[PDB]
Amino acid sequence: SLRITRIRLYKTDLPYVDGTVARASVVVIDTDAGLQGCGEFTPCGENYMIAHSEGVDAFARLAAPQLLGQDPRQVARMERLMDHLVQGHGYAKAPFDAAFWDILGQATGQPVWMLLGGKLCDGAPMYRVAPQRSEAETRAELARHRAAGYRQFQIKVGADWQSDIDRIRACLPLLEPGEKAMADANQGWRVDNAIRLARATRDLDYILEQPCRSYEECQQVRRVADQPMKLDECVTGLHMAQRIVADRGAEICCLKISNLGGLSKARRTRDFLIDNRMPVVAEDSWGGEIASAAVAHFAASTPEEFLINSTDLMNYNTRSTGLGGPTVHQGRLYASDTPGLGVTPDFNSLGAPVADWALP
Amino acid sequence: SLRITRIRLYKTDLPYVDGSYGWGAGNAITVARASVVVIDTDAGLQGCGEFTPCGENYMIAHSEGVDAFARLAAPQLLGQDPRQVARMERLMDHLVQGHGYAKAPFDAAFWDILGQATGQPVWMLLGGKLCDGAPMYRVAPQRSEAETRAELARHRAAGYRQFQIKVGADWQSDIDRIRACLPLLEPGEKAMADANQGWRVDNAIRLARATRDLDYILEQPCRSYEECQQVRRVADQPMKLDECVTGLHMAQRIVADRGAEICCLKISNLGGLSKARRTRDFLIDNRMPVVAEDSWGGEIASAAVAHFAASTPEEFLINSTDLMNYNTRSTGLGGPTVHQGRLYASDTPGLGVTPDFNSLGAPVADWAL
Amino acid sequence: SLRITRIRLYKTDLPYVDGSYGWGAGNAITVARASVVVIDTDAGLQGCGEFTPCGENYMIAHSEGVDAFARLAAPQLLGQDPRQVARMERLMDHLVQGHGYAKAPFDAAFWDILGQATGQPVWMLLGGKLCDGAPMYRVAPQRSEAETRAELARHRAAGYRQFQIKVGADWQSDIDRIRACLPLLEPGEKAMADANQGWRVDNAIRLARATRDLDYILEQPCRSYEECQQVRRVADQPMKLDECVTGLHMAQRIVADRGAEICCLKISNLGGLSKARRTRDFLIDNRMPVVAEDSWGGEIASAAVAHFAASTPEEFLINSTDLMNYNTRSTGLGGPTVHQGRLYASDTPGLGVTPDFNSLGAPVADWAL
Amino acid sequence: SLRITRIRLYKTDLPYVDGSYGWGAGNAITVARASVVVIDTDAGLQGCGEFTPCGENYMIAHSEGVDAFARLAAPQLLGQDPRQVARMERLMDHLVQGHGYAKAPFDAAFWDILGQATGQPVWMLLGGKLCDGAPMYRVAPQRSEAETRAELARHRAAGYRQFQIKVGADWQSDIDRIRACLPLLEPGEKAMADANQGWRVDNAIRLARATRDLDYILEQPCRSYEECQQVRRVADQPMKLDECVTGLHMAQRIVADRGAEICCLKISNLGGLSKARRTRDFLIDNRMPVVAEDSWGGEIASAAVAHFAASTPEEFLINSTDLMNYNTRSTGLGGPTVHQGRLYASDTPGLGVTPDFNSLGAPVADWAL
Numbered sequence A: 001s002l003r004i005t006r007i008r009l010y011k012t013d014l015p016y017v018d019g020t021v022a023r024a025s026v027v028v029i030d031t032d033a034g035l036q037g038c039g040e041f042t043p044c045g046e047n048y049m050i051a052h053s054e055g056v057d058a059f060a061r062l063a064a065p066q067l068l069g070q071d072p073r074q075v076a077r078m079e080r081l082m083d084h085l086v087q088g089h090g091y092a093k094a095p096f097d098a099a100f101w102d103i104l105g106q107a108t109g110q111p112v113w114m115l116l117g118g119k120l121c122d123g124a125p126m127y128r129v130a131p132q133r134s135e136a137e138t139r140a141e142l143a144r145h146r147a148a149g150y151r152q153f154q155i156k157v158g159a160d161w162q163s164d165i166d167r168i169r170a171c172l173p174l175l176e177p178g179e180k181a182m183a184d185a186n187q188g189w190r191v192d193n194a195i196r197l198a199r200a201t202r203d204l205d206y207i208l209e210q211p212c213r214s215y216e217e218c219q220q221v222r223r224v225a226d227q228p229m230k231l232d233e234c235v236t237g238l239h240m241a242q243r244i245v246a247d248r249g250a251e252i253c254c255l256k257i258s259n260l261g262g263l264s265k266a267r268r269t270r271d272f273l274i275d276n277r278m279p280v281v282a283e284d285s286w287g288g289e290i291a292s293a294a295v296a297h298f299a300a301s302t303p304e305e306f307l308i309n310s311t312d313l314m315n316y317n318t319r320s321t322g323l324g325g326p327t328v329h330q331g332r333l334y335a336s337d338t339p340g341l342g343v344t345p346d347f348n349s350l351g352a353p354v355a356d357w358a359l360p
Numbered sequence B, C, D: 001s002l003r004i005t006r007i008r009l010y011k012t013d014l015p016y017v018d019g020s021y022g023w024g025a026g027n028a029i030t031v032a033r034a035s036v037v038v039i040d041t042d043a044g045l046q047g048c049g050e051f052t053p054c055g056e057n058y059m060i061a062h063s064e065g066v067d068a069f070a071r072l073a074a075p076q077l078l079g080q081d082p083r084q085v086a087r088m089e090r091l092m093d094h095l096v097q098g099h100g101y102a103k104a105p106f107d108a109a110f111w112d113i114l115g116q117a118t119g120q121p122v123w124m125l126l127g128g129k130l131c132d133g134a135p136m137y138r139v140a141p142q143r144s145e146a147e148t149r150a151e152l153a154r155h156r157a158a159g160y161r162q163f164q165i166k167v168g169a170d171w172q173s174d175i176d177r178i179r180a181c182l183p184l185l186e187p188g189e190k191a192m193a194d195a196n197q198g199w200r201v202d203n204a205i206r207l208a209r210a211t212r213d214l215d216y217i218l219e220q221p222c223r224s225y226e227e228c229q230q231v232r233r234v235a236d237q238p239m240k241l242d243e244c245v246t247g248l249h250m251a252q253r254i255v256a257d258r259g260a261e262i263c264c265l266k267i268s269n270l271g272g273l274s275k276a277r278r279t280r281d282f283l284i285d286n287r288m289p290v291v292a293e294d295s296w297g298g299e300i301a302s303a304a305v306a307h308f309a310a311s312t313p314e315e316f317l318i319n320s321t322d323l324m325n326y327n328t329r330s331t332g333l334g335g336p337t338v339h340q341g342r343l344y345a346s347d348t349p350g351l352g353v354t355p356d357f358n359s360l361g362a363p364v365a366d367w368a369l
């Protein structure tokens, strides 16, 4: 027997470590037994997926009055309640969902990964971005990452196909045979140009990541490209996951929690793709300790054999959303083993809540 | 050159005329929450636009998401040329992906301004008057039984010849009200039974089989397109697809499958007049009959609809509707008129509607300079 | 209110600037035959439009067919309101089926009149200035290595970064043509090998195989779409479809198969500016890169091309072309301009072109109200 | 050895025998405009051909298009060997693309010359007399129960066993026409409801469902093939496809989908007797029932029809028609004959018809070697 007694929405700025600021949305849910749950949505750019930072407010102003008095431990009941209140807008339902999972974990005395089936991966592999500099300086920097445990690297591309060809051709002979490189275009290329790129780099082993915006443009690129393809921002739910599997249309599916509509749907999409023997990346768009805690539990419950990587989202910002969260040890991401999400809100960083709903 | 100098967002309550408007699987609205966007320019031309949902869970659209979008978009829209509608379209689409419902009132205001600057009604800029008076339908909502026999004689004498039976809350009694409404129709008349996504697929099939000997239009029996196609395997009745018609991509699927007999085009579900126009033109070029509509709303939303309907070829326009007449309160001064069961657009420049500032009250948001 | 009071048809020869133009399988044009439609109204607004083929066998189109259509339709078009472009389109499609190239000059005259009536350039009415300056290509060229390098450096200095290789008459020496040209281009430059429907399917495959190590655009290698798809099974090069892109129907199946990397849109091949616009918009919403052009012609044909180009998103517009600059004679006064290898539309009301009555001569036909 | 020495184009009015001829969605033909091509040779062998539309908007074909094609192609055909019909076919298709209706009279004239040079009727050159007297239909009637009975009794006694009901202007009263006509004909007889592209897809489906218990032929209910296939989702009646059957490509699509029970073959819609023969032979090899006919016209068009019918296997030939008997005026001297409700081709060399030069008047165009 449990009831939601208070819902608060927090908003804070998260500046990037190398310079520029993402807008965080934290939801804090209180119960009549005094169990507190938190969840976070933070976009990396407002135009990046069908998701923006102000949409959490909007959803909360409609839903939070209807969520008071309900039992947060029942994550799927809360899921169906939210999906009956508004259709879509999953990015905005996502912080609530995570907070409900946090509460269920506290009530059960278990970490969120245990409620997701167990620890199927002890330390999710991680990647390092870039480097975008001199040849001898990239060589020194990749050696620093390599010594520290990293074997995967993300070439950030997608703003100019022609110089992107140069970036890929320059980076790949600078890494060892045991090492992965994903050229992530972030939906950036036009279909003709992505094909020019793929043809120019056909003699190279790298992962071709979300070359174009839509799934169909990506499949058109795939008609020519032999490189293992990774689909990301277009993986928006189970429907898309079903179509990718039916087409066998990717070698890796990247699973971002808030793009999938929260940890509940993200887990179901993951479970679906694992059962179809599709390798996956477990992450989210952006964020601090609260978003990262959800990510780490999500990765820890993914089979080691099918988990490509995850990411330490909290280490990209100079400011915090939460106290605690996941940790990094030797280039691997580790979930908490303490009950719930293993993260509480950082109220000092968050400020006064922008909105507050409570039971009488 | 023209520049956007000011953007204001207004919110008001639009109560329903009959009291309760029962739709779908147990939903009802007593009051709809309107969102009105008002755009001012440096030549003193003012545009306006409206999104109002009929139910906050009806489509991928809710009233609070308009504010959220405007807080993001409106600062970036200031100083832009509002009469370049497709520049404004792609700018709004560069600022945020999706959320077409929220862009829809801005888009309408832009079309309004363009009409004023050209000295032409919005129907002219949409291709001309291809239908003089869109035929109308009268929706009888979810209520009793012996009282719809007088509702028909009311609307029959009023000029209407098309009627919507609201169903979807219980397939079994729904069979009975389809079966009792149809023999009350006259020869030159039509009836659509709208489930508003309400039936579970097996129950929509039971209904289709129990009413197989009847001539009516089966409208959006289930939530998804795939569910409706599953119903269509068994159902011979002309099918009308509505809330699942989200845009051109779905329109392409429907045409490729030849998967409906009517496609319903709700302006804000399509993401504004710009995208609504393009989806309309696509379906007509593929000889698919259409309904020109929006979700709900007052005079500003109804002005857009009327021009949408007026620029649709009459050979392919099933009906349209007078949304402003469903409410006890207003959003705009002006808008379309009705005469003998047909909806007539304004012939004055722009949308032919100005904001009812007295009804709307103080703006909830105001960006300027 | 506006009424068409006079329809006149003009015919004139436009000789090619460099003697003989070789396209496709050995075909040669030295003089192209222009058809110009001039439309008068009761409020003194005059519109004009043009269709000029490159060759008479180049597409489903020929110069004498405009006369034949005008002889049927021009009596029926008198008294109508030319501002209502979609009404005129529907009316023309009602009088005859197909013959889009013949309806195309009328459609351009109607857009011109609408522009003038609204005080806006045709690009505004097509959505806005979405590309300020369309990229252009050079047609070049056929000589020694040093003379090729010199002429390409002058084009490069003139602002050109796109080059068309005229092929299609002989697959075997076309292979060599391609191999000679590419190493003389710089990184980033586009080369299109336009066979103009010229290769037999097996020979096109041989060419694709012998040039698989090369970065160029393979353009319309065969007549039919199916043939081009059969080449596409082997060819990894970006494929541009042109003369087979005849309308929305074909557009839809190119999209469904993801059948090309570029779709080339010739206004008269699509049946006029109204249909061309709609096919453009469909392809752009499906994120297909496009070329905005026409078959051939003087200033009147070129004015429509430039507005069509200017209202295409810069992101997806591959190139356009300055058709008027290929001829020694004129159909119109005014038209588009060329600046630093880019094609610019006019910003004055309408198409921004008036008929060159002295060059055109006496009308071959005249219908008055 | 033989050479074309002279080509002449004639134009004449063919008034309809019964005043006005109501077809499709609100069309009427009172006078049809014939185009007759006359080809002379150096051995004194003369051939003639004809194209006459049944309404200018009926198919992708109009009367003025023959003139336009001729003006471009006829100077290029002088000196050529007209007996080599495939060489002439391929030359025409090289000179212009499409416009097969305009090529059709030239094609007929070449088959005429070949039959004369070989001393054999055209049916012999198309494979033989595979049907001795093609079965005919009567387009009757359109009136009262007392008057339909007397009219079907005179038609029955005259040998007729197949009846076309002209519908497609009002689906609702077309239901009633079908329902009132079918029980007024005996066991052996047949009836086809030809909507002539006239119904909208939703209305065609309503008609199909209302008459789902009845034995008739659903002919061309909607314009496009895809619209017709959508109707066919619901309609179990034998479907007859007509105007959309434009050539072999569409015949291949139809065969692949098995998308009709009868294919109607109009010579001029297929681009002439040569393409018409190839499309028929392809469909017969795929065991598709066919109708062998043409759009409209006098004795010259009807001569080609009768030879087309006579060389169609009788197991698969549904019917043919006596086109010459629909008009009050002539294009030719001779042509086919009618006996006991069957259409009979001539057995004399060539088409069996000469041009009625007196009815045709002065040549509108004249090309000489």
Ligand SMILES: [Mg+2]
Pocket (backbone or CB within 6 Å): A184, A186, A209, A210, A232, A233, A254
């Ligand atoms: Mg990615």
Ligand SMILES: [Mg+2]
Pocket (backbone or CB within 6 Å): B194, B219, B220, B242, B264
């Ligand atoms: Mg509906």
Ligand SMILES: [Mg+2]
Pocket (backbone or CB within 6 Å): C194, C196, C219, C220, C242, C243, C264
């Ligand atoms: Mg080309």
Ligand SMILES: [Mg+2]
Pocket (backbone or CB within 6 Å): D194, D196, D219, D220, D242, D243, D264
């Ligand atoms: Mg027929």
